[PDB]
Each structure stands twice: as C-alpha cells, then as structure tokens.
C-alpha cells in the first residue's frame, strides 16, 4: 500500500482540435460497422463526469496524493448517476453491437445502469457486491459494502447456508477473479475491435487485454485525454472527453442514448433489439 507502484500519474492531457475529433469519430463508426465482434474496456475516466475522480488524471487520487493534496468527490457512490457513456454502452449491447464489457472500475455504475452482468467482467471487484466465501453466491446491495481487501462484512449467506460474506474489492496483493479474467480474456482474443475508454492501461493484466485483439489481426482504438501505456499499438487514438466521443458516435450510428430508470440489476442479457441498417463503406 505504501510501497505499491502507482504508475505514471499526472501526465498532460491532449485535446484533438474539432475537425480532427470529427474525422476520428466518423472512423470509429466505420470500424464499429465492419466489426463482427466488439469489446469495450473501461476505466475511471468514464465516471469523472458524474463526480468520481480518477486515479492518475491531473486531479486523480494518486496524482493529488503525490502533491500532498486530497481528491475531491462531488457525489457519494450511492448517489452517483451513470454518465452518457455508461448509458451509451447499455444501448450498444441491447442492439448487438457490443459483445462484451471489461472494466477496472469498482464504482458499481455499469451494474446500476442496468448493463447485463453476464456480458460484464469486473476485474477489480464492485463496491456494492459481497460474495459468500462458502458457496460463491453474490449479493448486489443498494449501499456500498463497508470493507475492502476481500474481508468479512459481518453478514451471512441466505441461500436455500450461513457462509461468511466478503467484499469483492481487490487489494494490491490480490489476484484477479478467474471467471471474470478468463471471460474477459476469451472476449479480447476473439474480438476484431477493442475500444478503450478512460483508462491509462497501466495495470496488468487488466491493461494488456486490449492488445490480445491485435493477435489474429484485430483493431485497437484508445479514447483517452492522457497518454496511455499502449498508445503506439493503437490503430486510432482519440483525444477528447469520452461523453462527447460517445454521443457523437451514437448519432452517427443512428442510436438513442436511453434513459436511466434509477438503480437496477440485470443478471442476464435480454434478446437483441432492432437496429439501423449499415452504411455502404467502399
Ligand atoms: N472525461 C474523460 N474523457 C476521456 N478521458 C478521461 C476523462 N476523464 C478522465 N480521463 C482519462 O481517464 C484515465 C483514467 O486512468 P486512470 O486514472 O489510471 O485509471 P484506470 O481505471 O486506468 O486505473 C486502473 C486501476 O488502477 C488503480 O490502482 C485502480 O486499481 C484502477 O481499477 C486518465 O488517463 C485520464 O486522462
Ligand atoms: O483512493 S482510495 O481511497 C484507495 C483504495 C484502496 C487503496 C488505497 C491506498 F492507496 F491507500 F492503498 C486507496 N479509493 C476508494 C475510496 C472509497 C471506496 C473504495 C475505494 N477504492 C477501492 C479500490 C480503489 C479505490 C479508490 C477509488 C475508487 C473509485 C474512485 N475513486 C477512488
Ligand atoms: Zn453461501
């Protein structure tokens, strides 16, 4: 915790100017339309626009710590609303254009946005989710579970059990959950397009998964304000706010960003909804 390498923190942000931002967002569209299999990888930068600071941005938790400053939250985790980005991902999966979702965030927003838990991998855990150490059943709570580092919460299992309930928050020592990791790994290997949103790609193995898509010749897109660890492996790099990138993309795809009903848990992905027909791309 004290010794832990927190990577490169506080690097400068890059702003594509607007004509270049438009041409790159069109090309991202172009790639989504030609792909058989898209996998989105997310990090802390998709939740900054709902009041949650990131780790390594100019005012992220590790950056500010290095300067002797505190990070600032403009919300509780319980009151946080999902961003436009979160909601765009909800809709892309409902229309069959997202195959699988890989995230490093523990903030619980992808589940609460209504995104299906069977197309989602929560690599670093989920602050609302506690797990039965005996039977492995998970409970998705309406408030954050008070502990981190896979400790006992003090509640017991209700399954038709009495096993000890534990948070799912990984500590620096802890290895990733295997279901989640193997699923994310399988998805990344078979993907023909991996799109990274608000991650600096510095944590392993979480940050390496998108590179798997490069094997067998897949394409890789990074959307990020700062430089990331794998910027030179990318076919397209977009330097912009993710909400502005996601909303323009959705408009090119002819899709609405749907309304959030408030906190909801969906275990299993629903049957695919109709979607616009695809443009002819020479
Ligand atoms: N609105 C935005 N639009 C685009 N990019 C953004 C925005 N806001 C922030 N960024 C970018 O968002 C990036 C966020 O990167 P980082 O802070 O390293 O977070 P991670 O999720 O990769 O952290 C990985 C793990 O490491 C930790 O120990 C925890 O274990 C995490 O689970 C920055 O470069 C910003 O420029
Ligand atoms: O910075 S933290 O307090 C934190 C967590 C674990 C370990 C440390 C350490 F540096 F002290 F080791 C700090 N912090 C945190 C704060 C409250 C609840 C949970 C977390 N949390 C868990 C993993 C990473 C963070 C992280 C975080 C998560 C999402 C958005 N913003 C920050
Ligand atoms: Zn149990």
Swiss-Prot record:
Catalytic function, reaction form: N(6)-acetyl-L-lysyl-[protein] + NAD(+) + H2O = 2''-O-acetyl-ADP-D-ribose + nicotinamide + L-lysyl-[protein]; N(6)-tetradecanoyl-L-lysyl-[protein] + NAD(+) + H2O = 2''-O-tetradecanoyl-ADP-D-ribose + nicotinamide + L-lysyl-[protein]; N(6)-hexadecanoyl-L-lysyl-[protein] + NAD(+) + H2O = 2''-O-hexadecanoyl-ADP-D-ribose + nicotinamide + L-lysyl-[protein]; L-lysyl-[protein] + NAD(+) = N(6)-(ADP-D-ribosyl)-L-lysyl-[protein] + nicotinamide + H(+)
**Could you name the active-site residues?**
124 (proton acceptor)
> GO molecular-function annotation terms?
chromatin binding; chromatin DNA binding; damaged DNA binding; DNA binding; DNA damage sensor activity; enzyme regulator activity; histone deacetylase activity, NAD-dependent; histone deacetylase regulator activity
Site note Formation of an covalent adduct with nitro-fatty acid activators applies to 9
Q: How is it modified after translation?
A: Acetylated at Lys-24. Deacetylation at Lys-24 by SIRT1 promotes homomultimerization and binding to double-strand breaks (DSBs) sites. Deubiquitinated by USP10, also preventing its degradation by the proteasome.
- Supply the enzyme class, top level: transferase
The UniProt-reported impact of residue 54 to H is: Found in a family presenting with four cases of perinatal lethality caused by severe neurodevelopmental and cardiac anomalies; uncertain significance; abolished histone deacetylase activity; abolished protein demyristoylase activity; decreased ability to recognize and bind double-strand breaks (DSBs) sites; does not affect nuclear localization
Q: Where do Pro residues bias regions lie?
A: 271-280
Tell me what controls its activity. Answer: Compared to the defatty-acylase activity, the protein deacetylase activity is weak in vitro, and requires activation. The histone deacetylase activity is strongly activated upon binding to nucleosomes and chromatin in vivo. Two molecules of SIRT6 associate with the acidic patch of one nucleosome, while the C-terminal disordered region of SIRT6 associates with nucleosomal DNA, leading to efficient histone deacetylation. The protein-lysine deacetylase activity is also activated by long-chain free fatty-acids.
Result when mutating residue 258 to L: Found in melanoma; somatic mutation; reduced histone deacetylase activity; does not affect the protein-lysine demyristoylase activity
- Residues recorded as bearing N6-acetyllysine in the entry: 24
Q: Briefly describe its induction.
A: Down-regulated in a number of cancers, such as pancreatic cancer or colon carcinomas. Post-transcriptionally regulated by miR-766. Expression is post-transcriptionally repressed by miR-122.
Which residues does Zn(2+) bind?
132, 135, 157, 161
Q: Which domain of life is it from?
A: Eukaryota
- Result of changing residue 24 to Q: Mimics acetylation, leading to impaired ability to recognize and bind double-strand breaks (DSBs) sites
Assembly mode: Homodimer; binds to nucleosomes and DNA ends as a homodimer. Interacts with RELA; interferes with RELA binding to target DNA. Interacts with SMARCA5; promoting recruitment of SMARCA5/SNF2H to double-strand breaks (DSBs) sites. Interacts with the mTORC2 complex; preventing the ability of SIRT6 to deacetylate FOXO1. Interacts with the CLOCK-BMAL1 complex; recruited by the CLOCK-BMAL1 complex to regulate expression of clock-controlled genes. Interacts with CSNK2A2; preventing CSNK2A2 localization to the nucleus.
Domain note: The C-terminal disordered region mediates non-specific DNA-binding.
Q: What is this protein called?
A: NAD-dependent protein deacylase sirtuin-6
Q: Which organism is it from?
A: Homo sapiens (Human)
Q: Which residues of the full protein are shown?
A: 11 to 298 of 355
